[PDB]
Ligand SMILES: *[C@@H]1O[C@H](CO)[C@@H](O[C@@H]2O[C@H](CO)[C@@H](O[C@@H]3O[C@H](CO[C@H]4O[C@H](CO)[C@@H](O)[C@H](O)[C@@H]4O)[C@@H](O)[C@H](O[C@H]4O[C@H](CO[C@@H]5O[C@H](CO)[C@@H](O)[C@H](O)[C@@H]5O)[C@@H](O)[C@H](O)[C@@H]4O)[C@@H]3O)[C@H](O)[C@H]2NC(C)=O)[C@H](O)[C@H]1NC(C)=O
């Protein structure tokens with residue numbers, strides 16, 4: 142009978158989950174050691190442990206077939222079994238899997254070890270993306286210096302790993318097919334448990350695109366005044382090196398030159414942070430307080446004892462790209478961040494602690510449920526906090542923003558500043574996976590791989606490289622997530638749903654009322670709101686125990702991903718900006734780039 146078997150299956154899963162947690166802990170420790178300290182020895186060990194765990198998961202997947210799990214009464218038991226049948230890369234033959242792991246570490250270590258020569262001193266060649274090159278990209282307003290660093294970085298982080306990247310695409314596809322997905326794209330998209338999810342994102346992106354065009358237009362207008370028409374054309378894509386960021390994913394670093402009201406306050410608290418003697422530790426402590434102020438969980442002692450919150454000053458190599466780690470025990474959670482004392486880094490700290498909070502909130506769950514309701518939820522949690530941290534309201538409370546008058550013009554400056562990060566990023570994030578999906582699905586010949594990348598960056602974002610690229614270059618792996626094989630759609634989803642979360646949390650905190658000019662959504666601070674916190678607790682404690690619409694329902698009673706909340710946030714900006722572009726006769730739209738030669 143199935144009644145007796147379903148009772149046995151329940152005990153089988155209970156023991157197996159605990160075993161998976163314990164085995165993954167060993168892999169996670171080895172991965173943590175590699176990322177904190179990149180050596181051939183640590184690579185070998187990371188990859189050998191993973192291979193062992195891969196082998197064990199194969200065995201588990203095979204063992205699921207001895208249970209009639211699809212026949213069971215429990216949706217919960219069925220959901221857990223379904224999770225165990227999904228092997229990912231672990232479906233590959235032993236040798237193929239090992240080759241893949243060597244390929245991935247080759248790519249991530251290459252990215253992490255990139256060094257460029259100083260623009261002004263080619264004897265000094267120890268400049269790393271983080272912090273040296275990123276400091277320049279964000280601060281320099283010398284367009285030739287900007288273009289020099291762009292070309293050096295992209296040549297070393299991108300083109301250098303073309304053949305490894307090709308091999309990864311093959312093995313990624315092979316793995317997906319061994320799981321009976323058409324490609325890696327369907328493998329990634331499976332995490333969202335919704336067969337119309339791509340179309341949903343297309344619909345939502347289409348609604349926000351006109352606002353992005355207006356922002357793009359206005360920024361291009363303002364850059365022309367700064368750099369002149371020789372550097373920036375009216376009708377062409379924006380030279381991406383002028384946008385304050387190596388990938389042009391967010392443009393807030395050039396707010397000083399494109400802000401709507403240059404003679405009104407622009408929030409940039411980096412200087413005050415330094416003046417008040419802030420450290421990385423202080424920044425994490427403040428993030429902690431934010432979470433505990435909402436009646437959420439305080440960081441445990443293991444976090445403080447084991448996290449790395451500053452770039453090491455010994456000679457070593459490591460992955461500085463920030464990350465949050467769950468070791469699947471109790472309270473062993475850590476962050477690795479090469480923290481700097483700046484405004485953007487304060488937001489990052491809160492973002493990462495959102496990951497840590499999710500880990501702590503679902504650690505009581507069975508292992509297979511110890512992850513986000515979908516990858517987007519995990520990325521959204523901390524960003525909901527960063528939105529209120531970013532408000533003048535909050536920055537005044539913590540004494541980082543002084544003598545701030547919030548008149549109508551300063552409001553527009555702050556809305557635009559936020560848009561430069563929140564709206565600008567949407568097309569960027571969409572293209573990161575549109576590109577990889579197209580490679581995974583076999584839609585682009587290998588001979589056209591680099592111009593397929595720049596073509597998407599043009600079509601959706603209206604940016605282009607500073608210099609002519611060709612199919613001799615290979616520019617995509619210059620983005621961390623592309624070198625490190627991290628699905629990027631999570632972030633598009635996060636930037637949409639975080640405003641659904643933020644809006645609802647602000648309403649619960651009494652911080653937003655649409656019909657009250659004193660409680661605007663763009664100045665809501667949820668700090669200290671236990672109502673807000675309760676919503677977070679209800680959602681986050683579920684982990685992946687239910688499909689994501691049930692997790693959203695737990696937060697605010699909604700079950701649909703919607704662009705309504707983000708549009709609602711920026712509606713005051715849209716009205717103002719549309720009128721400002723008309724007043725200044727701003728050209729909108731762009732010609733096709735001439736920057737990637739076939
Ligand atoms: C991805 O899709 C793949 C298909 O495209 C799929 O691969 C198939 O998985 C099947 C197992 O689910 C497998 O079916 C078995 O076939 C055996 C012999 O087939 C040979 O010939 C093939 C044709 O050329 C070769 O290609 C193969 O290499 C094979 O050598 C059968 O002997 C076998 O049977 C036994 O099992 C069934 C299943 O029983 C189930 O459970 C209970 C049993 O207790 C039943 O009561 C219940 O009703 C249910 O049926 C028994 O019914 C039967 O009595 C035997 O005991 C079985 O049918 C198939 O061979 C395989 N490949 C292909 C190409 O077809 C992958 O599994 C998919 N991957 C993932 C990750 O999902």
Ligand SMILES: O=C(N[C@@H](Cc1ccccc1)P(=O)(O)C[C@H](Cc1cc(-c2ccccc2)no1)C(=O)N[C@@H](Cc1ccc(O)cc1)C(=O)O)OCc1ccccc1
Pocket residue numbers: 390391462463464465466467485486488489492493496512513519520524627632
């Ligand atoms: O550590 C991660 N993820 C990190 C990436 C990563 C994935 C896999 C392995 C290693 C690392 P991140 O996105 O926190 C690491 C960071 C976060 C960040 C940066 C910023 C930020 C703020 C101001 C300026 C520039 C950046 N804000 O937040 C990240 O990857 N951010 C994205 C995009 C992003 C930008 C802004 C933002 O608000 C949110 C996201 C990027 O850098 O491209 O894992 C989370 C996790 C773990 C287990 C299960 C589910 C989820």
Ligand SMILES: *[C@@H]1O[C@H](CO)[C@@H](O)[C@H](O)[C@H]1NC(C)=O
Pocket residue numbers: 178180181182183455457
């Ligand atoms: C880095 O790992 C190596 C193993 O290759 C080890 O010998 C060394 O102790 C580690 N270095 C640091 C600074 O932790």
Ligand SMILES: *[C@@H]1O[C@H](CO)[C@@H](O)[C@H](O)[C@H]1NC(C)=O
Pocket residue numbers: 436671672
């Ligand atoms: C904190 O959480 C508890 C239960 O976890 C809840 O009952 C209580 O309302 C919360 N604290 C406050 C001040 O609301």
Ligand SMILES: [Zn+2]
Pocket residue numbers: 492493496519520
């Ligand atoms: Zn993240």
